[PDB]
Structures are given as C-alpha cells and as structure tokens.
C-alpha cells in the first residue's frame, strides 16, 4: 500500500531532517538512506536484514519509502513499513527511511519525523 | 479542556443540503482523526464518516455514501461536512468526535472516541 | 452487533453487559470499546481496547472478551451508573466501516 506524505517544508543539497520540516527524495535525471530506484526498473534496496536487488515491471508509489518504528516499551528500533511498490510482475529516485514513534502523532501521511540525514 | 462545538443544525427540506461544521480546541487538531456519528431520536448510534488528519483517508458509511463529503481546515481548527441530497431517513443528532488513537499509522482500524462535542439536531421534514 | 436490550440489578452488584457480534468484528479484532451515555448528554467512552479505562473513568468498570462475545462488567452498582451503554468495534466485511450495538439500557 503506497501513501503520499505531507507537512513538508518547501525552500546539489538534499536533506531529510526535522527541526522546519524536510524529506527530499524526488526524481532526478541513523542509516536513513537504504537505496535507490531507477528506470522495467531496477529496485535496489537495503532493508533491515537484507540487500534485495530486482528487476520488474514494478508500480512504484508517487512517494516511496521504508519506515522504522520506536518503541519506547523496549526502547527498539524495528523496522515495519516497507511502502516501494504495489507491484512487481534515465531516471531515478532516492529511498529514505521515516521514523515514527510516540512522538509523532497522526495518520500513514503525517504521523512522521526523520533522523538527520544528507545526501 | 479539550472541545468540539457542532453548528450548521437546523431545519430542511427533504431533498436539499445542509452544511454542519464544528470548531476544535484544547488539543493539536492536526495530529487526530475526527469521526462523525448520528443518533436518531429514540435510536442508538450510527457511524457517518471521518477524515484523516491528512485528509487523505476518508471513509463514509455505505448508508451516506455519495451524498456525503466530509472536509476539513487544519488552519482553522474546522471540520466541515457537506450533507447534499438528504432525506426524512437522515433526522438525526450528529456529533463530530475525537479519535482516541493518535497513531492511525499504527493500527488504522482501531478506533475509539475520546471526546465528543454537545452535538447538533439536523431535521429533514415539511 | 447485537446486545441485550436492558440489563438489571440491585446496588453492589455486578452486572454484565453482553456485546455479540461475528469473528470479522468481534472475534479477530481486539479493538472493542464501550460508551455510556445519560439521557441528553453526547456519549463517554468507558472502555477500549477490549479492557483498557481512560484516565477519568472509576475503576468500577472493565471490560473482557471471549470468542465472538465481548462483555462489559460494572462492579459496586451504583444509581449513578444508569445509562444507555454502547458497543462499537471494527468490521471488516466488504468496504471498511465501524459500527455500534443496539445499546443496552442499565436500571
């Protein structure tokens, strides 16, 4: 299930980052970079346990990302989201983790922060 | 205090529309969920709708559905709901109420009302 | 959802609030909450989560649940406790929804 996020700042330099409020990952010509997506397409990505490489005809979200969670009962960062495509039967895009926790409140598009991250 | 204060109730016809809208206070309305819920007079209660606080989910009751839409102004603390087409069926009390999970991202089905506003009679008759 | 239409009893005792409903609402969701409601007043929630009380609530009140049914128990009965309580939960048949029960009348 792919989701647009929102409550982002507007104003080469990209950074992800939460004071003003940023996530740059468009598409160009704390390990919060995982990978990359370029395009068939090719999905290059590093998720928590492994580094998965694939080529596919894939749906890629308008805004695609991974998503690491806090809980503060075990204070342990795990990761559960994993929002890329919705399927898999010259340009590229670069995937960020969020991270969200009791301190980010709201629903799948705004309940969100992000470690500091540059790129 | 946290408070919801329902306006736009009142008389109409069948047939016509009806704008209810409520004010929020005490609490971050950008970071909650708000569900409408209706209770006709001598009835229980019905869930309506609601609005995420992105606005990018929105569910409405297959009973509403298509007639209804729902809409809110984070900058204004204002929830909106836009009643088009409704019928003597709709005579009901409707409240606008707080979702209780502020973390919609986490189990999205889960939901419960923590606050709910005074609520606001809509009567659909002539 | 279906609910007893009244439920009864003398001061001090404990009545429970039945709330029966199907395994695609009550049974696979744990996500069962209650609400009591005085006569002209908008609705309190008592009850979420199946058995978690919101701060503010006495500790009179708690809920459980087994198989399709969730119940609702009032402990020390109180005169103050007469309302119309309310079951709402999760359903996940066809489109996405949530629903109450009929509610049930406490004397």
């Known amino acids: 299930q792919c989701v647009n996020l929102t409550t982002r700042t507007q104003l080469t330099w990209f950074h992800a980052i939460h004071v003003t409020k940023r996530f740059d990952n468009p598409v160009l010509p704390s390990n919060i970079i995982r990978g990359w997506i370029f395009g068939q397409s090719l999905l290059i990505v590093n998720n928590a346990t492994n580094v998965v490489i694939k080529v596919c005809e894939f749906q890629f979200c308008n805004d695609p990302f991974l998503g690491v969670y806090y809980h503060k009962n075990n204070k342990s960062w795990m990761e559960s989201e994993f929002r890329v495509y919705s399927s898999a039967n010259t340009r590229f895009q670069t995937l960020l983790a969020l991270h969200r926790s009791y301190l980010t409140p709201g629903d799948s598009s705004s309940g969100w922060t992000a470690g500091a991250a540059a790129y | 205090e946290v408070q919801l204060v329902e306006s736009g109730g009142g008389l109409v016809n069948p047939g016509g529309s009806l704008r209810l809208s409520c004010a929020a206070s005490?609490?971050?309305?950008?970071?909650?969920?708000i569900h409408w819920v209706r209770q006709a007079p001598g009835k229980g209660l019905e869930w309506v709708s609601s609005?995420?606080?992105?606005?990018?989910?929105?569910y409405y009751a297959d009973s509403v559905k298509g007639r209804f839409t729902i809409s809110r102004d984070n900058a204004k603390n204002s929830l909106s709901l836009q009643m088009n087409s409704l019928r003597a069926e709709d005579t009901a009390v409707y409240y606008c109420?707080?979702?209780?999970?502020?973390?919609?991202?986490?189990?999205?089905?889960?939901?419960?009302?923590?606050?709910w506003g005074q609520g606001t009679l809509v009567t659909v008759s002539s | 959802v279906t609910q007893p239409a009244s439920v009864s009893g003398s001061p001090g005792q404990s009545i429970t609030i039945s709330c029966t409903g199907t395994?695609?609402?009550?049974?696979?969701?744990?996500?069962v909450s209650w609400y009591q409601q005085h006569p002209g007043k908008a609705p309190k929630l008592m009850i979420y989560d199946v058995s978690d009380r919101p701060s503010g609530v006495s500790n009179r009140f708690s809920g459980s649940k087994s198989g399709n049914t969730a119940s609702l128990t009032i402990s020390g009965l109180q005169a103050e406790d007469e309302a119309d309580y309310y079951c709402?939960?999760?359903?996940?048949?066809?489109?996405?929804?949530?629903?109450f029960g009929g509610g049930t009348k406490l004397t």
């Open positions: 005490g609490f971050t309305f950008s970071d909650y969920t």
């Open positions: 395994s695609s609402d009550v049974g696979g969701y744990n996500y």
């Open positions: 709402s939960s999760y359903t996940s048949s066809s489109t996405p929804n949530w629903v």
């Open positions: 109420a707080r979702d209780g999970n502020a973390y919609k991202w986490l189990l999205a089905e889960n939901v419960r009302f923590d606050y």
């Open positions: 609005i995420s606080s992105s606005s990018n989910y929105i």
